[PDB]
Design a protein around this motif. Structure first.
Motif, PDB file in Angstrom:
ATOM      1  N   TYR A 190       7.757  -3.841  -3.581  1.00 59.14           N
ATOM      2  CA  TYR A 190       7.622  -4.028  -2.146  1.00 59.14           C
ATOM      3  C   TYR A 190       6.623  -5.152  -1.883  1.00 59.14           C
ATOM      4  CZ  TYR A 190       3.311  -1.386  -2.741  1.00 59.14           C
ATOM      5  OH  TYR A 190       2.063  -0.984  -3.152  1.00 59.14           O
ATOM      6  N   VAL A 191       6.792  -5.822  -0.751  1.00 59.59           N
ATOM      7  CA  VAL A 191       5.855  -6.851  -0.324  1.00 59.59           C
ATOM      8  C   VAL A 191       4.530  -6.223   0.123  1.00 59.59           C
ATOM      9  CG1 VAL A 191       5.423  -8.706   1.358  1.00 59.59           C
ATOM     10  CG2 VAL A 191       7.703  -8.458   0.299  1.00 59.59           C
ATOM     11  N   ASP A 192       3.426  -6.727  -0.417  1.00 57.32           N
ATOM     12  CA  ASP A 192       2.100  -6.244  -0.042  1.00 57.32           C
ATOM     13  C   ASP A 192       1.836  -6.477   1.450  1.00 57.32           C
ATOM     14  OD1 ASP A 192      -0.985  -6.614   0.298  1.00 57.32           O
ATOM     15  OD2 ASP A 192      -0.744  -5.605  -1.639  1.00 57.32           O
ATOM     16  N   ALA A 193       1.395  -5.444   2.165  1.00 55.72           N
ATOM     17  CA  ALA A 193       1.234  -5.562   3.617  1.00 55.72           C
ATOM     18  C   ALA A 193       0.172  -6.568   4.061  1.00 55.72           C
ATOM     19  CB  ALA A 193       0.958  -4.200   4.245  1.00 55.72           C
ATOM     20  N   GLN A 194      -0.762  -6.870   3.165  1.00 57.82           N
ATOM     21  CA  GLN A 194      -1.856  -7.776   3.484  1.00 57.82           C
ATOM     22  C   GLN A 194      -1.645  -9.170   2.895  1.00 57.82           C
ATOM     23  OE1 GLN A 194      -3.879  -6.526   5.676  1.00 57.82           O
ATOM     24  NE2 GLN A 194      -2.979  -4.477   5.472  1.00 57.82           N
ATOM     25  N   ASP A 195      -0.688  -9.287   1.981  1.00 62.44           N
ATOM     26  CA  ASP A 195      -0.402 -10.561   1.327  1.00 62.44           C
ATOM     27  C   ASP A 195       1.103 -10.724   1.146  1.00 62.44           C
ATOM     28  OD1 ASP A 195      -0.311 -12.915  -0.108  1.00 62.44           O
ATOM     29  OD2 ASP A 195      -1.909 -12.352  -1.502  1.00 62.44           O
ATOM     30  N   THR A 196       1.725 -11.393   2.108  1.00 58.71           N
ATOM     31  CA  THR A 196       3.174 -11.541   2.146  1.00 58.71           C
ATOM     32  C   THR A 196       3.747 -12.273   0.934  1.00 58.71           C
ATOM     33  OG1 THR A 196       5.052 -12.363   3.455  1.00 58.71           O
ATOM     34  CG2 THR A 196       3.021 -13.662   3.501  1.00 58.71           C
ATOM     35  N   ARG A 224       2.872 -11.663  -2.099  1.00 56.18           N
ATOM     36  CA  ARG A 224       2.674 -10.812  -3.259  1.00 56.18           C
ATOM     37  C   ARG A 224       3.606  -9.608  -3.208  1.00 56.18           C
ATOM     38  NH1 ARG A 224      -3.033  -7.562  -4.509  1.00 56.18           N
ATOM     39  NH2 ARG A 224      -2.039  -5.714  -5.452  1.00 56.18           N
ATOM     40  N   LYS A 225       4.197  -9.263  -4.349  1.00 58.42           N
ATOM     41  CA  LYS A 225       5.002  -8.053  -4.464  1.00 58.42           C
ATOM     42  C   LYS A 225       4.415  -7.107  -5.500  1.00 58.42           C
ATOM     43  CE  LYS A 225       9.641  -9.495  -2.960  1.00 58.42           C
ATOM     44  NZ  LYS A 225      11.093  -9.460  -3.300  1.00 58.42           N
ATOM     45  N   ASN A 226       4.164  -5.872  -5.080  1.00 57.11           N
ATOM     46  CA  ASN A 226       3.659  -4.846  -5.979  1.00 57.11           C
ATOM     47  C   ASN A 226       4.785  -4.071  -6.620  1.00 57.11           C
ATOM     48  OD1 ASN A 226       1.111  -5.602  -5.030  1.00 57.11           O
ATOM     49  ND2 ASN A 226       1.307  -4.173  -3.307  1.00 57.11           N
ATOM     50  N   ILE A 227       4.514  -3.478  -7.775  1.00 59.18           N
ATOM     51  CA  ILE A 227       5.555  -2.787  -8.541  1.00 59.18           C
ATOM     52  C   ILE A 227       5.088  -1.375  -8.879  1.00 59.18           C
ATOM     53  CG2 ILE A 227       6.954  -2.803 -10.659  1.00 59.18           C
ATOM     54  CD1 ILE A 227       5.822  -5.892 -10.812  1.00 59.18           C
ATOM     55  N   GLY A 228       5.920  -0.380  -8.597  1.00 60.69           N
ATOM     56  CA  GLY A 228       5.630   0.990  -8.981  1.00 60.69           C
ATOM     57  C   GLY A 228       6.746   1.602  -9.810  1.00 60.69           C
ATOM     58  N   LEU A 229       6.445   2.692 -10.510  1.00 62.19           N
ATOM     59  CA  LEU A 229       7.509   3.480 -11.153  1.00 62.19           C
ATOM     60  C   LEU A 229       8.148   4.462 -10.185  1.00 62.19           C
ATOM     61  CD1 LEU A 229       5.965   4.714 -14.563  1.00 62.19           C
ATOM     62  CD2 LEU A 229       7.754   2.972 -14.255  1.00 62.19           C
ATOM     63  N   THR A 230       9.472   4.580 -10.226  1.00 58.39           N
ATOM     64  CA  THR A 230      10.120   5.648  -9.493  1.00 58.39           C
ATOM     65  C   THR A 230       9.971   6.953 -10.264  1.00 58.39           C
ATOM     66  OG1 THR A 230      12.216   5.301 -10.620  1.00 58.39           O
ATOM     67  CG2 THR A 230      11.918   4.113  -8.519  1.00 58.39           C
ATOM     68  N   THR A 231      10.390   8.038  -9.620  1.00 55.95           N
ATOM     69  CA  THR A 231      10.529   9.333 -10.269  1.00 55.95           C
ATOM     70  C   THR A 231      11.321   9.232 -11.574  1.00 55.95           C
ATOM     71  OG1 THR A 231      10.486  10.434  -8.131  1.00 55.95           O
ATOM     72  CG2 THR A 231      11.283  11.725 -10.004  1.00 55.95           C
ATOM     73  N   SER A 232      12.451   8.542 -11.551  1.00 51.24           N
ATOM     74  CA  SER A 232      13.210   8.383 -12.786  1.00 51.24           C
ATOM     75  C   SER A 232      12.431   7.564 -13.839  1.00 51.24           C
ATOM     76  CB  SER A 232      14.599   7.797 -12.528  1.00 51.24           C
ATOM     77  OG  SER A 232      14.506   6.506 -11.968  1.00 51.24           O
ATOM     78  N   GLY A 233      11.699   6.541 -13.415  1.00 52.97           N
ATOM     79  CA  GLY A 233      10.912   5.747 -14.353  1.00 52.97           C
ATOM     80  C   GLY A 233       9.804   6.548 -15.031  1.00 52.97           C
ATOM     81  N   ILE A 234       9.153   7.398 -14.254  1.00 58.09           N
ATOM     82  CA  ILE A 234       8.111   8.259 -14.791  1.00 58.09           C
ATOM     83  C   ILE A 234       8.713   9.218 -15.819  1.00 58.09           C
ATOM     84  CG2 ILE A 234       6.625  10.219 -14.236  1.00 58.09           C
ATOM     85  CD1 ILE A 234       6.086   8.695 -11.562  1.00 58.09           C
ATOM     86  N   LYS A 235       9.838   9.831 -15.455  1.00 58.16           N
ATOM     87  CA  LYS A 235      10.539  10.760 -16.346  1.00 58.16           C
ATOM     88  C   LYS A 235      11.008  10.082 -17.633  1.00 58.16           C
ATOM     89  CE  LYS A 235      12.055  14.100 -12.782  1.00 58.16           C
ATOM     90  NZ  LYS A 235      11.522  15.304 -13.486  1.00 58.16           N
TER      91      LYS A 235
END
Lengths: 137, 140
Positions: A78-84, A86-97
């Motif tokens: 997702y695009v960082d709300a304070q820095d357009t 920049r895109k942050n990356i997270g693991l989904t539920t499936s990625g964690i599993k």
């Protein structure tokens, strides 16, 4: 079989089993490392540049890799709300599993090993292996 | 003091690798130099060139050049121009290069005897059979 042979073969097979677990989960070794890094550090709000430095890879290899993982929805971006820019990356539920499933191969091998022997036999085996390890030290 | 088999196998393998590294240090050779000597030792019959060694080690010419210069300075190898082809330099082990390789290799027999001597004859038979069973369980 000498001990040198047995220990070398055992080590090799354990490593092979880990590689096979990745294959079974349909991910490459590098994809696995990428997911594992996200798993350990995603609290920070990680970007592609963070990933690239961690994998010691170039931006283009990281982009394709992230594109691949995202196509499987093992990660989200997702695009960082304070820095357009920049895109942050997270693991989904499936990625964690998936990360936890790959990691579980080590516990699974340990249980396979333990199940070959009876309880006292395991105790003597571990005691003697400890004596052996001690003698090399 | 209640270790997993996994910890134990990893640690035993680690210590055996460390013992071999310590033997290299004692003989004053690097890992890469040992690999070069070992390759020469295994192919002492063919009249090996720098290029053969480079292809075998999958290193670059310059890297092999520097490795061979170091080994030659220690008189563990000699090099000479091939009589039939002036563009080829052949490499062989000296007496000492052979002795150094055999001295290094002795560490594996040494460790095996150290391990065996920790257990009685019966324990050893049991340990080997059990490790064999365990190895098989990881394969199938």
């Amino acid at each position: 079989f000498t001990y040198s042979y047995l220990f070398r073969m055992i080590s090799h097979e354990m490593k092979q089993k880990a590689d096979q677990k990745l294959e079974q989960l349909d991910i490459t070794n590098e994809q696995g490392h990428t997911l594992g890094y996200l798993y350990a550090h995603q609290q920070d709000g990680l970007t592609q540049n963070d990933i690239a430095k961690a994998l010691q890879r170039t931006g283009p290899t990281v982009s394709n890799l992230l594109r691949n993982l995202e196509r499987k929805k093992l990660i989200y971006r997702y695009v960082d709300a304070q820095d357009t820019r920049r895109k942050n990356i997270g693991l989904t539920t499936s990625g964690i599993k998936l990360v936890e499933a790959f990691t579980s191969i080590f516990d699974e091998m340990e249980q396979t090993l333990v199940s070959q022997l009876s309880e006292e036999e395991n105790e003597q085996m571990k005691a003697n292996l400890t004596k052996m390890l001690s003698s090399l030290q």
